[PDB]
Amino acid sequence: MSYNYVVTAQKPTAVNGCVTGHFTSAEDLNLLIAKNTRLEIYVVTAEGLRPVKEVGMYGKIAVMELFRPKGESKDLLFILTAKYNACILEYKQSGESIDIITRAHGNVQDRIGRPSETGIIGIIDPECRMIGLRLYDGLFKVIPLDRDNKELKAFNIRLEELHVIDVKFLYGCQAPTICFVYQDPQGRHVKTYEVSLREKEFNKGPWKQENVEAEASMVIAVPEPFGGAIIIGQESITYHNGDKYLAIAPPIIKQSTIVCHNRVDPNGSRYLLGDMEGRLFMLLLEKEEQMDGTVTLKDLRVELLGETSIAECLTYLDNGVVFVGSRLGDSQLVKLNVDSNEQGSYVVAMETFTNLGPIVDMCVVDLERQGQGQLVTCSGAFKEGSLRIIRNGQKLHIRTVPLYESPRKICYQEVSQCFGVLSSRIEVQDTSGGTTALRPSASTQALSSSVSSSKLFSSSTAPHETSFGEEVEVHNLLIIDQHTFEVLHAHQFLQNEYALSLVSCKLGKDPNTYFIVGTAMVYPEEAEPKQGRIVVFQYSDGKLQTVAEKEVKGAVYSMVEFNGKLLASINSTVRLYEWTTEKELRTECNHYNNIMALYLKTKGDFILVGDLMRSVLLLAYKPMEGNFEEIARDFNPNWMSAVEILDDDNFLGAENAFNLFVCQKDSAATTDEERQHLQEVGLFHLGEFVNVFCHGSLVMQNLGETSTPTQGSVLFGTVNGMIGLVTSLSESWYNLLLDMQNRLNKVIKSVGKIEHSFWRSFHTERKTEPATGFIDGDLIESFLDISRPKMQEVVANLQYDDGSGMKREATADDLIKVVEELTRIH
Amino acid sequence: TESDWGKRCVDKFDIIGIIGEGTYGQVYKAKDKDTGELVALKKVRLDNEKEGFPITAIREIKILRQLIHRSVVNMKEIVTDKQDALDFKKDKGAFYLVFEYMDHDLMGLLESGLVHFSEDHIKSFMKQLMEGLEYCHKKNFLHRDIKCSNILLNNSGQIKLADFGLARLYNSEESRPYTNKVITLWYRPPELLLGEERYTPAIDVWSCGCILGELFTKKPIFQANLELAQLELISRLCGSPCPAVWPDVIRLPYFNTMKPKKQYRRRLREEFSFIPSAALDLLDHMLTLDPSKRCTAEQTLQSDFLKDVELSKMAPPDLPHWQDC
Amino acid sequence: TKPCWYWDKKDLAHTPSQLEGLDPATEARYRREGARFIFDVGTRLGLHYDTLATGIIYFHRFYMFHSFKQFPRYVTGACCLFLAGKVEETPKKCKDIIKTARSLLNDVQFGQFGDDPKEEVMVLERILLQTIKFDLQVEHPYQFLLKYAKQLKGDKNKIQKLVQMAWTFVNDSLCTTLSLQWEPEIIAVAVMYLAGRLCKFEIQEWTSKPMYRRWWEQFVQDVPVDVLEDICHQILDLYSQGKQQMPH
Ligand SMILES: CC[C@H](CO)Nc1nc(NCc2ccc(-c3ccccn3)c(=O)[nH]2)c2ncn(C(C)C)c2n1
């Protein structure tokens, strides 16, 4: 068996959702911000936000909504986790003591159902009579909000329309009514139903179905003064309400897909819209009152306000202040002014909240030379693209290098006192026949520049037609100074060439240190690329000079230096190259038993290969034979997102289902087959999507540091900005920390009353297993924050093992010291 | 000649890697040095010498040389390790079974969640499976081990059944005691849960229905760690075993012993309301408690869902692609 | 695709056993003994008639590729029966076959099994499988005797007498190389033909074509009487050589 420890070094930073309301008091204006597994509660002031409380939940927050049922003084909070843990929460404050009440809770998962493409949707009735959930195709689940439903029991209503895009409860209806956009072979439609709690079925809805734009994406529930709904698409915005129909199709919105909506004026006169390029729009609803006294909707208008960060959620707060919740970039507070500034913008940034964004890649390098270690991460996407240099100081110090284009991979080259960064920027087919970039960015603002003239694929004779307005990715290699972080050089790769891998190393008997990049020819027609290049560059005297090129018949997904040789993965093949005295790469040996070799890692002569669906293989190079040999494979099927080698026998992997596992050689040499079976001895549900695993420690490393119980250091980056550290334990230390978890779980009160053991259970759509071989470091580190009565309750009847004293009782002061040493790792 | 199996040496194949560990022996992927065709070789070990050649491999050889169908895997030949020269008693070399190589297996494709099945994809998958099962059931062979892992699919979209190690012939006139509880718990029929031991071909049909539902939900229908719990899960959806729906349920050994919590009513049509009507009817008949009332393979092929499916169009599934990565 | 398991009578003059100096009478006797050894061992163990026959067919085929002087028959027989049991799903443990073989064999005969009987048998399985070219499925005259008899309609007792007499002829033919000369379908017809001659029955009357004097042609196409007579001659020779007479 294996024993390992996981700790959350930096908490998730990306904003996954955000709401406003009156949650802490019926009087205050609240802003609740949801980051993965984290809920942040703020109170709105005239200058900004006053933080009041933060809680963690044992689950990914999927639905977050505030409502106020008749009889309550203040808003209640509904949250549903991605594992279908539902709960209703209340804020309660006793002077200085702030706690969160679990008013109702339960798990709403169905035994049989197909998870929907557009994900979990959760909505609540304007009269707060019920909670609507769209969890599975063809089914609508209703949790009625009666006082007695403390377990959140629910029923399903058969829904004929299998493929639903979005749904909202409507305002102004005689009965609870849902309005939704759905897709069938004939296109997309908008349709209504009435929900009867008494009959437990749908009844005919208030207004007829209408055919809508093919890419109709979002439903906006218009308030009572107008009623009805607005449907947002790629090209058009339409209003529907019985006999009334409006459509505005302003050319400005066609340019970028609109992804987020919020209401500015409670009556619905003004709404806010944002798009993937970061533009913020004001949607205006023009009113017309008839002599009857009835208010109708006259027309719709769209006005461009300015630019914000690409935002997952918008929420207007008060006065001119809007909170911009960003997942791909830093989140923001911005003020909307009535008068434009001299550039034509009505939007002026107030505050900027650090979001490590998607961490596509990262490297740990001791830039200071202090032995501490700094983490430079490839963070953000598109305009929000950034390099983030992170050091420990008690908070983490983070520096931001704006790139305005997406970063893909990073590697450090000490000989050149610089980093290499792979980037992709978006250009659009323009009337010249070429392409034009939407904004300047790192690859265009380099001091010196170069464009590849390779003729390897120049024979072509393969047609790829271009239509005006289509997007293309232009991938580049950035040479960036390690002190100034100035783009010294940018090399533009070939048209339709995407950069997938990058390494810096010396090869063979060649004393020069090179940047080596692996690329693939990407054509929309091909599901899998069949052409690729391996390129050797040298960065010298401010210029990047190409040394050699190798044509491969596929995509160079990953590369890694192997004892003076270049190890590369091309599609289904793993190939090792030698570097000749003629400065040209030469094929040596190949391995083909992989469906798609996405990730590579080396230790000694051992190679860990990550397949798309076949988990990991322990390959080895036998020098005497000059060929590869399969040592062992994990036959259990998994989808890999990142792998890492812990030691010669333990191997760590990340699953696309937000899961982590550790494989070990069975080490029983009785049969050859036993050695060949990698047994999964560790299972854990991280809750984050790990993209990169990197050996190193951010915390200061000194020869004098008290040797911690933990051994080894692997840092991992995730899509939501979370950075974590994995380390190993001795059998004795694991059992102690494991036994303590079980004691802590009985003592610590969970938000929503979610069982910790369930949360960490390995979970795919098909399987759920109890966690094994892993210590939730965060749970262990929470011992220091529980009250003294609880601490002593935890240590009761707790015995140590395999130590100086075989059985040794624990006291509350003893464990406080142990955990405090465990907090020094991060 | 092509028919002289067991003489050719495994030297004629270059091993690429071990695709999977078969329960009876490991399975490796290799290339025929002469033709370049990828084939799969299953290692049969005579070293144990407890029972000599494993009977599981014996059954696969006996049966698959008889069965010819597009939806049944083809054993091409049997090859051997370099045998000891003129000393058969010292020889302990193993025998390897030549088969057609398969790009993917259904269990792996589902677990990676990398495949999205349309109705039309399922139609082509199910039609091939039933036609194969019908061929085998017409030849009076019972697979007895229908599982997601055992279904094999080439990227083209063709499906072939493969693990016949537990298969045996069925005599309608003289039903005899067979290996009890052969199928894996997730895909096991209720009759075996109750230990019929004299089961009909309908046992394989039950499993294929479990697959049918699983293709639509992308999750196995009945997942349990205990035989009783599986009966409970089945009972909730398909209804509790009761004499009215299963007149002969009382004759089954464990009927009084193994009981669901309640006498649940059938809810299959309600819980699978999202499944198309043509398919839902197939599921209701395939997942029928009484083996005598359970549909046959031919009846599934003559269903509105599958009768008008044309095998010319094999509808390849959304296969793993680099954009997906 | 599939191997040829049938030879011409003239070809048996050139079995490995013959060319090593064994005369035709001795190989014939060596076959009867080995077959009957297989039959008796499996009958003591309670084995189905197909299982006995399958082993016997393996045995007969084996000594078309090997010599009786290098492979003791009784060991081979036991090995054939052991494998047959697994092929036909009537399995037996090798130790139990040895136990029975010892019970039925004297001391000289059991000497073939050597110091370790089980080992000599289990080892040979490798050679047996390669010899029979892994063609394990075997059809036997029994199933055709019944498939064809079911299509006869007439006096219940006269047909049952025909079947049992023919069935006995099938059991006796397992001691001969007919298994190596003619497909089982022909054997089933030949034994029907022989019993009919002996019981003075005219089988055509019981067929759906009562005026088709060559009654067998509707069961087995392309069989001249020449073949059925050659077979009958070979079966009755065993009775004339021995002391046993036709069952009647
Ligand atoms: C023996 C047990 C397995 C599973 O249940 N059964 C099976 N699977 C087959 N092909 C599917 C498959 C499996 C594994 C891989 C793979 C895995 C890692 C790396 C590269 N490749 C693959 O790519 N394809 C197959 N092909 C022929 N056979 C038998 C010999 C009849 C097969 N038997």
Coordinates of C-alpha atoms in Angstrom, one line a residue, chain A residues 217-417:
Chain A
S217 CA -28.0 30.5 -25.4
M218 CA -29.6 32.2 -22.4
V219 CA -33.1 33.0 -21.0
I220 CA -33.6 36.2 -19.1
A221 CA -36.7 36.4 -16.9
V222 CA -38.2 39.9 -17.3
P223 CA -39.7 41.5 -14.2
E224 CA -43.4 42.2 -13.6
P225 CA -43.7 45.6 -15.3
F226 CA -43.0 44.0 -18.7
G227 CA -43.3 40.3 -17.9
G228 CA -42.3 37.6 -20.3
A229 CA -38.7 36.7 -21.3
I230 CA -35.7 37.7 -23.3
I231 CA -33.7 35.2 -25.4
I232 CA -30.0 36.0 -26.0
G233 CA -28.2 34.5 -29.0
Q234 CA -25.1 34.9 -31.1
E235 CA -26.7 37.5 -33.5
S236 CA -30.0 38.5 -32.0
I237 CA -31.9 39.4 -28.9
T238 CA -35.6 38.7 -28.8
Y239 CA -38.4 39.4 -26.4
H240 CA -41.4 37.0 -26.1
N241 CA -44.6 37.3 -24.2
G242 CA -47.8 35.7 -25.6
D243 CA -48.7 37.9 -28.6
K244 CA -45.8 40.3 -28.2
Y245 CA -42.6 39.7 -30.2
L246 CA -39.5 41.9 -30.6
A247 CA -36.1 41.3 -32.2
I248 CA -33.0 43.5 -32.3
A249 CA -30.0 42.2 -34.2
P250 CA -27.3 44.9 -33.7
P251 CA -24.1 44.0 -35.7
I252 CA -21.9 44.8 -32.6
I253 CA -22.9 41.6 -30.7
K254 CA -22.3 39.2 -33.7
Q255 CA -18.5 39.8 -33.2
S256 CA -18.3 38.0 -29.8
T257 CA -20.5 35.5 -28.0
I258 CA -22.4 36.8 -25.0
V259 CA -22.1 34.7 -22.0
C260 CA -23.4 36.5 -18.8
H261 CA -26.4 38.5 -17.8
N262 CA -27.6 40.6 -14.8
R263 CA -30.4 43.0 -14.0
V264 CA -29.5 46.6 -13.4
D265 CA -32.9 48.1 -12.7
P266 CA -35.3 45.9 -10.5
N267 CA -38.2 46.7 -12.9
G268 CA -36.2 45.4 -15.9
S269 CA -35.7 48.6 -17.8
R270 CA -31.9 48.1 -17.9
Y271 CA -29.8 44.9 -18.1
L272 CA -26.1 44.1 -18.3
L273 CA -24.5 41.7 -20.9
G274 CA -20.9 40.6 -21.3
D275 CA -19.1 38.7 -24.1
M276 CA -16.1 36.4 -24.4
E277 CA -13.9 39.3 -25.7
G278 CA -14.5 41.2 -22.5
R279 CA -17.0 43.8 -23.8
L280 CA -19.7 45.1 -21.5
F281 CA -23.1 46.1 -22.9
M282 CA -26.1 47.8 -21.5
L283 CA -29.4 46.3 -22.7
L284 CA -32.1 49.0 -22.7
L285 CA -35.8 48.1 -22.5
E286 CA -37.8 51.1 -23.9
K287 CA -41.2 51.5 -22.3
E288 CA -44.5 52.7 -23.8
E289 CA -47.5 53.4 -21.6
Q290 CA -51.0 53.3 -23.1
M291 CA -53.9 55.5 -22.1
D292 CA -55.3 52.2 -20.7
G293 CA -52.7 52.5 -17.9
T294 CA -50.9 49.4 -19.1
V295 CA -47.1 49.4 -19.6
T296 CA -45.8 47.6 -22.7
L297 CA -42.4 47.0 -24.2
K298 CA -41.8 49.3 -27.1
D299 CA -38.4 48.4 -28.3
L300 CA -35.0 47.0 -27.3
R301 CA -31.6 48.8 -27.7
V302 CA -28.1 47.7 -27.1
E303 CA -25.4 50.1 -26.0
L304 CA -21.7 49.4 -25.6
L305 CA -20.3 50.6 -22.3
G306 CA -16.6 49.5 -22.3
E307 CA -14.3 46.6 -21.5
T308 CA -14.1 44.4 -18.5
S309 CA -12.3 41.1 -17.8
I310 CA -13.9 38.1 -19.6
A311 CA -16.6 37.4 -16.9
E312 CA -18.3 34.2 -15.8
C313 CA -20.8 36.2 -13.7
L314 CA -21.8 39.8 -13.6
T315 CA -23.6 41.4 -10.7
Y316 CA -24.6 45.0 -10.4
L317 CA -24.2 46.2 -6.8
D318 CA -25.3 49.8 -6.3
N319 CA -24.8 53.3 -7.6
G320 CA -22.4 52.8 -10.5
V321 CA -20.6 49.8 -9.1
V322 CA -20.6 46.4 -10.8
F323 CA -18.7 43.3 -9.7
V324 CA -17.1 41.3 -12.6
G325 CA -16.5 37.7 -11.7
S326 CA -13.8 36.2 -13.9
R327 CA -12.7 32.6 -14.3
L328 CA -10.2 33.1 -17.1
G329 CA -8.8 36.3 -15.8
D330 CA -8.7 38.6 -12.7
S331 CA -12.1 39.6 -11.3
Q332 CA -13.0 43.2 -10.8
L333 CA -15.0 46.1 -9.4
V334 CA -15.7 48.7 -12.1
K335 CA -17.7 51.9 -12.0
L336 CA -20.2 52.8 -14.7
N337 CA -20.3 56.5 -15.4
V338 CA -23.1 58.5 -17.0
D339 CA -20.5 60.5 -19.0
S340 CA -18.0 58.8 -21.1
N341 CA -14.3 59.4 -20.7
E342 CA -12.2 60.9 -23.6
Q343 CA -11.7 57.5 -25.2
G344 CA -15.5 56.9 -25.4
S345 CA -15.7 54.5 -22.5
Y346 CA -18.1 54.6 -19.6
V347 CA -16.3 51.9 -17.6
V348 CA -13.4 52.7 -15.3
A349 CA -11.7 50.0 -13.2
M350 CA -11.8 50.4 -9.4
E351 CA -10.2 47.3 -7.8
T352 CA -8.5 44.1 -9.2
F353 CA -8.8 40.8 -7.5
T354 CA -6.1 38.3 -8.2
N355 CA -7.2 35.2 -10.1
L356 CA -4.4 32.7 -11.0
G357 CA -6.8 31.8 -13.9
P358 CA -6.3 28.5 -15.6
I359 CA -2.8 27.3 -14.8
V360 CA -1.9 25.6 -18.1
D361 CA 1.7 25.0 -17.1
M362 CA 4.2 26.1 -14.5
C363 CA 7.8 25.6 -13.4
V364 CA 9.5 25.9 -10.0
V365 CA 12.8 27.8 -10.2
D366 CA 15.0 29.5 -7.6
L367 CA 15.2 32.9 -9.2
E368 CA 16.3 34.6 -6.0
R369 CA 19.2 32.1 -5.5
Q370 CA 18.1 32.1 -1.8
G371 CA 17.1 28.4 -2.1
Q372 CA 13.5 29.4 -1.6
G373 CA 11.9 28.7 -4.9
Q374 CA 9.6 30.8 -7.1
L375 CA 6.6 29.5 -9.1
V376 CA 6.1 31.0 -12.5
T377 CA 2.8 29.9 -13.8
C378 CA 1.1 30.1 -17.3
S379 CA -2.1 31.7 -16.2
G380 CA -5.2 33.1 -17.9
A381 CA -6.5 32.9 -21.4
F382 CA -6.8 35.3 -24.4
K383 CA -6.7 39.0 -23.1
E384 CA -6.2 37.8 -19.6
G385 CA -3.1 35.8 -20.4
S386 CA -0.4 36.3 -17.9
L387 CA 2.8 34.9 -16.3
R388 CA 2.5 34.9 -12.5
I389 CA 5.6 34.7 -10.4
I390 CA 4.7 33.4 -6.9
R391 CA 6.8 33.5 -3.7
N392 CA 6.1 32.9 -0.1
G393 CA 6.2 35.6 2.6
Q394 CA 1.9 35.0 6.2
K395 CA 0.7 35.4 2.6
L396 CA 1.9 34.5 -0.9
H397 CA 3.5 37.3 -3.0
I398 CA 2.3 37.2 -6.6
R399 CA 3.6 39.3 -9.6
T400 CA 1.7 39.5 -12.8
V401 CA 3.2 39.8 -16.3
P402 CA 0.5 40.7 -18.8
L403 CA 0.6 38.9 -22.2
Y404 CA -2.8 39.6 -23.7
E405 CA -2.6 36.2 -25.4
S406 CA -3.0 32.7 -24.2
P407 CA 0.0 31.0 -22.6
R408 CA 0.4 27.3 -23.3
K409 CA 3.8 26.0 -21.9
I410 CA 6.7 27.4 -19.9
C411 CA 10.3 26.3 -19.3
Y412 CA 13.4 27.9 -17.7
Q413 CA 16.8 28.2 -19.4
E414 CA 19.3 29.4 -16.9
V415 CA 22.2 29.7 -19.3
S416 CA 20.3 32.4 -21.1
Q417 CA 18.9 34.1 -17.9

